Amino acid sequence: KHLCSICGDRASGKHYGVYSCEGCKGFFKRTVRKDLTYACRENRNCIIDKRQRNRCQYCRYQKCLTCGMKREAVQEER
Amino acid sequence: RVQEELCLVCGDRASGYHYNALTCEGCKGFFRRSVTKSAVYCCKFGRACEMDMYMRRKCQECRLKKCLAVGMRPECVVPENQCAMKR
DNA sequence: CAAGGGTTCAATGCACTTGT
DNA sequence: GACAAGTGCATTGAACCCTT
Ligand SMILES: [Zn+2]
Ligand SMILES: [Zn+2]
Ligand SMILES: [Zn+2]
Ligand SMILES: [Zn+2]
Numbered sequence: 166k167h168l169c170s171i172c173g174d175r176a177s178g179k180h181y182g183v184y185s186c187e188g189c190k191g192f193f194k195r196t197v198r199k200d201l202t203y204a205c206r207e208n209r210n211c212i213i214d215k216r217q218r219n220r221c222q223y224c225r226y227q228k229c230l231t232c233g234m235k236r237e238a239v240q241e242e243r
Numbered sequence: 244r245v246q247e248e249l250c251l252v253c254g255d256r257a258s259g260y261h262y263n264a265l266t267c268e269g270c271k272g273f274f275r276r277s278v279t280k281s282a283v284y285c286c287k288f289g290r291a292c293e294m295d296m297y298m299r300r301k302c303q304e305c306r307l308k309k310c311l312a313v314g315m316r317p318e319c320v321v322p323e324n325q326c327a328m329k330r
Numbered sequence: 331c332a333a334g335g336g337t338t339c340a341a342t343g344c345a346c347t348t349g350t
Numbered sequence: 351g352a353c354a355a356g357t358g359c360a361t362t363g364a365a366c367c368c369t370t
Contacts, residue, residue: 174297177364178333187363194336195361216296219343219362243336243368258344259354269343275356276341300342300363321356326349330356 170232171225174215181238183229188218193229196222197239251313252306253299262315269299274310277303278320 167176169186180190195201203223205211211224218225248257250267261271276282284304292298292305299306311317321327 180334187365189363190334191363192361222361238335240335261354267343268345271355272343273341303341319355326355 169215171228171234172213172215172218174218181229181234181236183233185229185232185234186215189225189229189234192222192225193234194239196226196229197236198242252309253294253296255296255299262317262319264310264314266310266313266315270306270310270315273299273303273306274315274317275320277307277310278317282307 167178167184168174169176169189170183171185171189174186174188176184177187177190179185181193185193196203201222203221203226205221205223207221209224209227211221213221213225213228248265249255250257250270251265252270253267255267255269257265258268258271260266262274266274277284282303284302284307286292286302286304288302288305290305292302294302294306294309
């Protein structure tokens with residue numbers, strides 16, 4: 166029923182602390198697992214929504230963080 | 244006045260004219276792959292999705308229908324020229 | 331059963347190379 | 351060159367599996 170608090174796509178439930186879609190769950194997981202750092206090619210305030218969330222990996226990751234997603238909830242690879 | 248060149252299919256930023264239509268790299272590749280595989284898709288909604296950056300990954304049938312409606316030419320994908328007898 | 335951890339891999343789309 | 355057609359491959363995310 167819920168919406169992803171990051172992007173407004175349909176949430177599949179809570180993940181890493183926040184209501185989120187499989188997209189944002191997957192993306193946060195990969196980011197934390199590989200310990201990736203992104204750079205924004207604009208002004209660090211890009212639109213992240215269901216339509217254009219893939220245009221800025223920095224801004225998407227920052228928005229996962231501001232929405233409440235916890236790096237510590239991402240487990241080690243199995 | 245033209246602030247962004249727009250993909251006629253989905254409204255993302257267009258990279259150029261591909262198979263005779265102003266389109267983004269996503270729609271270009273989707274169209275090429277659809278055509279080279281002769282894919283037949285089946286919309287699991289109402290056969291009438293409006294295409295945008297979200298609905299382009301959700302409905303292949305309606306995306307391909309839009310590609311064609313905007314003038315993408317499937318006969319121009321890997322036609323039988325000398326270059327193909329190559330590969 | 332449900333939730334929220336996990337994983338998978340076909341499709342995707344960005345960056346590239348090739349041909350004119 | 352600059353463009354458009356073709357290619358390589360890392361990333362995306364819907365659909366699974368696993369343990370509580
Ligand atoms: Zn999301
Ligand atoms: Zn950004
Ligand atoms: Zn497009
Ligand atoms: Zn459709």
